[PDB]
């Protein structure tokens, strides 16, 4: 659910 | 001492919210960013900023928007706020169709180029990666 930018 | 914040208007808050990218960039859609833009809209509305929300801009549209905003008359505004929500790398923010250097965006508001913001606080809030390093943290 955490993704990177 | 402190910036004069009692001009007639707090100033502009530009929110550039890039969610959907052309897949020739190789970048994925940024789910959740709409929640960010809405939260920012409300937060800066309570601070009495005139919030302008912009969605899925190309890098040409980013450069052109920032140029146009820098050419407005900010004489009656206390400050300027710009929020960038997108993918990025060190020094770089992505339009929907590819990267643009942050320095090109911010140079429009330099003290010699945007005279009606001279001496006034210019705040850039940047939600974007700055590289691929990972912080594994440390327990205390």
């Amino acid at each position: 659910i955490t993704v990177a930018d | 001492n402190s910036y004069k914040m009692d001009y007639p208007e707090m100033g502009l808050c530009i929110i550039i919210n890039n969610k959907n990218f052309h897949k020739s960039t190789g970048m994925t859609s940024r789910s959740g960013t709409d929640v960010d833009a809405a939260n920012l809209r409300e937060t800066f509305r309570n601070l009495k900023y005139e919030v302008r929300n912009k969605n899925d801009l190309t890098r040409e549209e980013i450069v052109e928007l920032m140029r146009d905003v820098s050419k407005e008359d900010h004489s009656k505004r206390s400050s300027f706020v710009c929020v960038l929500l997108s993918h990025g790398e060190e020094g770089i923010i992505f339009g929907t169709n590819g990267p643009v250097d942050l320095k090109k965006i911010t140079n429009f508001f330099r003290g010699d180029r945007c005279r009606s913001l001279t001496g006034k606080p210019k705040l850039f809030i940047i939600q974007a990666c700055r590289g691929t390093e990972l912080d594994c943290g440390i327990e205390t």
Binding site: A4 | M5, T43, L47, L85, C129, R130
Partner: protein, 93 residues
Amino acid sequence: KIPVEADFLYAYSTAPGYYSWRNSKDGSWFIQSLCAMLKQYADKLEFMHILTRVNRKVATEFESFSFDATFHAKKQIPCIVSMLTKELYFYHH
């Protein structure tokens, strides 16, 4: 006169070179925390001290959850870059 680069503040979500993390439902850690701290403290604290509280919230309260072990259990510190020449208070009086 003043430098042409003076009176800029760059509030970065993450340290130079690093990934920035975003919850796919709730939004980016940094913007969530920034809005929360401004709502709580915009009428009591100078902007740098608000941003320092954003730094603490992101650093202490958030850790990544990923089905891919390479991106799991990761941490983030925002990065305040100030060329401001004065304190910035949003309220008045």
